[PDB]
Design a protein around this ligand. Structure first.
Ligand SMILES: Cc1cc2nc3c(=O)[nH]c(=O)nc-3n(C[C@H](O)[C@H](O)[C@H](O)COP(=O)(O)OP(=O)(O)OC[C@H]3O[C@@H](n4cnc5c(N)ncnc54)[C@H](O)[C@@H]3O)c2cc1C
Ligand code: HEM
Length: 591
């Protein structure tokens, strides 16, 4: 968008891993081109060079500077904005800003899951978690009488049908259970477009649970459920029909990046799926219960992009005024201040690192920016990029360590923001969120209502609002393992133009909201598609992976290489912001 201030959050259209962000990376990864910089002069010298400008890389710079207050630090990032998966999206509607989150969504169970170091970072940045108990408008949608709904599609169920009053409790649920505005299981499932037989079988799944593994010991049941997909468990042990289990296919797409065919039944049990109540399995532990019980309210209006923005402002005060969690939300960021010469911390966007080599007690780093190669030097280096990227960069890796890094196959996801002129159609249909079992977008919702800083969430159904929807390009029921579904999902996204992505959005919104007078051409006033082709870190999947071999690969992959330490959430095989922070802390301590 030339002619305006350099300001990525205001961009709409094809975002996430946008055109321009990945082309050099694919020249290495797909064509095996090597970009050597050993014959170029060193242009700049730092104490620390960080490859990758997501939460992990920014946390690496932050904890390094805490240990080394005078440190000169360069962060090299290939997207056009900092933050990695944590991106701020903006819309202009009716003279005001509407904020959305491009990716990394909320702080997950922070009281239970965030380490003392991560809590220390939040404290120093001015984030008081208790503020979200009032910032998050928990009773807003429930108090309007709205509920969650399931949209059955004609292609999979014979008819389009929206069924509201869903009582399903979700893993990370922002709605109190007594505020779901839901119906009984019998009344809810009674409206499903399924045969009477299938409807009775689903209702009995809730009303009359049975020990589908009768005879087995608890240990044998746990082993079986770790090795059996949720879908197969429902088919073979519960006995639901192939059409019945379709209702469950996409429910796990968002939180696991795969469908029920690739979800271990044991993981479905931990996530609160039905069918386990009479198996006699142990109740979840203290940690599992304290984590599951925390309200899912720790949501800045732009998601975890606020964490990245807080860190950038703390590292480079010239970029934006202010301090603390309230004024960050509408703070104005000046991107021309990110990379100023002589300044101790510099964040260099649109730059793909291509080479990392230990030399003479320091680290030489090559990168490509605007098609030209550059060479810089640090005493230390943190690889905070995608771990499968590291073997193409770090020239000092053993064959074994390079292979281990390559086994972290990340999952693709698409987080789409849609600006609507109004949300009367949602009010008329009595809904604030829709689950679609088989369609591309499995989750479609009015955005979380959060008031923070000077930002107020949209309130008036006659006025504009942001919608969030999740599309995961799974290939269900094909016999693929998880790594293959992930790679194939990326191939599917690579083949799709923005025009094809927009058609899927407009088609599905029109089919679901149209009966209430929605007109996609008239009522959609903005679309931002955050394409996270390399989204969640891989995670150990008991359907396909051996735990002992997987933990060994993970630990080998993140082994320090001279003065080069390895971070990113990938290094934990754990797709969370607190893992991104903790892996950076480990890497900084190693140096
Ligand atoms: C759609 C989505 C939703 C999520 N929601 C949540 C949530 O609610 N809660 C939660 O805790 N976590 C969530 N996450 C997990 C998320 O991965 C982490 O929260 C965190 O954002 C990851 O930070 P990171 O630094 O580990 O990785 P990233 O954010 O991916 O940062 C790595 C960066 O390195 C860059 N890079 C790669 N190669 C190079 C190179 N050669 N040179 C330079 N830079 C390079 C990448 O382009 C990227 O920008 C979500 C993730 C996704 C994809
Ligand atoms: C910051 C953005 C990106 C980076 C750094 C990046 C980097 C890479 C690398 C290094 C590989 C090789 C993996 C290996 O050999 O182990 C790869 C694979 C691949 N990428 Fe990307 N890529 C990016 C964005 C994208 C986008 C936007 C798409 C599609 C729209 C895409 C599609 C694919 C596909 C299909 C593969 C092959 C399957 C796989 O091995 O995962 N990538 N990417």
């Amino acid at each position: 968008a030339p002619g305006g201030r350099y300001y990525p959050p205001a961009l709409t259209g094809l975002r996430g891993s946008h055109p321009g962000a990945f082309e050099v990376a694919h020249q290495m990864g797909w064509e095996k081109k090597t970009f050597d910089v050993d014959h170029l002069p060193i242009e700049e010298e730092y104490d620390l060079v960080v490859v990758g400008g997501g939460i992990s890389g920014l946390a690496a710079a932050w904890f390094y500077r805490e240990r080394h207050p005078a440190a000169r630090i360069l962060v090299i990032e290939n997207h056009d904005d900092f933050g990695g998966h944590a991106k701020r999206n903006e819309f202009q509607a009716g003279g005001r800003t509407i904020l959305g989150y491009g990716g990394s969504e909320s702080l997950q169970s922070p009281n239970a899951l965030y380490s003392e170091d991560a809590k220390h970072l939040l404290k120093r940045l001015g984030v008081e978690l208790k503020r979200f108990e009032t910032a998050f408008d928990t009773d807003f949608y429930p108090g309007l009488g709205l509920s969650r709904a399931v949209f059955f599609d004609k292609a999979s169920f014979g008819v389009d049908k929206l069924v509201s009053g869903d009582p399903t409790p979700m893993v990370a649920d922002e709605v109190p259970r007594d505020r779901l505005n839901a119906r009984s299981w019998r009344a809810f499932i009674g409206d499903f477009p399924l045969s009477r037989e299938d409807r009775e079988a689903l209702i009995a799944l809730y009303e009359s649970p049975r020990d589908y593994l009768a005879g087995k010991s608890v240990e044998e049941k746990e082993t079986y459920l770790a090795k059996t997909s949720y879908r197969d468990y429902l088919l073979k042990n519960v006995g639901l029909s192939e059409t019945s289990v379709k209702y469950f296919q996409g429910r796990s797409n968002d939180f696991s990046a795969l469908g029920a065919d690739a979800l271990p039944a044991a993981d479905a049990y931990a996530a609160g799926f039905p069918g386990f109540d009479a198996l006699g399995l142990p109740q979840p532990s203290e940690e599992a219960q304290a984590e599951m019980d925390e309200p899912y309210i720790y949501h800045f209006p732009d998601g975890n992009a606020s964490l990245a923005r807080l860190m950038v402002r703390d590292l480079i005060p010239a970029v934006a005024p202010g301090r603390g969690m309230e004024d960050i939300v509408m703070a104005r960021f000046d991107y021309s201040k990110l990379d100023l010469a002589g300044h101790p911390v510099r964040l260099r966007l649109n730059s793909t690192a291509v080479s990392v080599r230990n030399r003479a007690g320091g680290v030489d780093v090559g990168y490509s920016r605007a098609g030209r190669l550059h060479r810089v030097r640090g005493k230390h280096c943190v690889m905070a990029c995608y771990n499968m990227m590291v073997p193409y960069l770090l020239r000092d890796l053993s064959e074994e360590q390079a292979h281990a890094l390559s086994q972290n196959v990340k999952f693709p996801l698409v987080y789409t923001k849609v600006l609507l002129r109004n949300w009367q159609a949602w009010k008329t249909l009595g809904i604030h969120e829709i689950y679609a079992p088989t369609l591309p977008y499995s989750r479609i919702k009015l955005d979380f209502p959060v008031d923070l800083g000077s930002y107020r969430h949209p309130r008036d159904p006659r006025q504009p609002i942001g919608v969030h929807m999740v599309y995961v390009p799974t290939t269900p029921n094909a016999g693929m393992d998880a790594r293959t579904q992930a790679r194939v999902g990326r191939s599917k996204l690579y083949a799709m133009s923005f025009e094809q992505l927009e058609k899927d959005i407009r088609d599905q919104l029109q089919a679901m909201l149209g009966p209430a007078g929605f007109d996609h051409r008239r009522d959609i006033t903005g679309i931002t598609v955050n394409r996270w082709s390399h989204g969640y870190s891989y995670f150990m999947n008991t359907l396909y992976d051996d735990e002992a071999e997987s933990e060994a690969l993970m630990e080998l992959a993140r082994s320090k290489v001279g003065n080069v330490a390895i971070a990113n959430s990938d290094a934990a095989w754990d797709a969370y912001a607190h893992a991104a922070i903790d892996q950076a802390v480990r890497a900084v301590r190693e140096l």
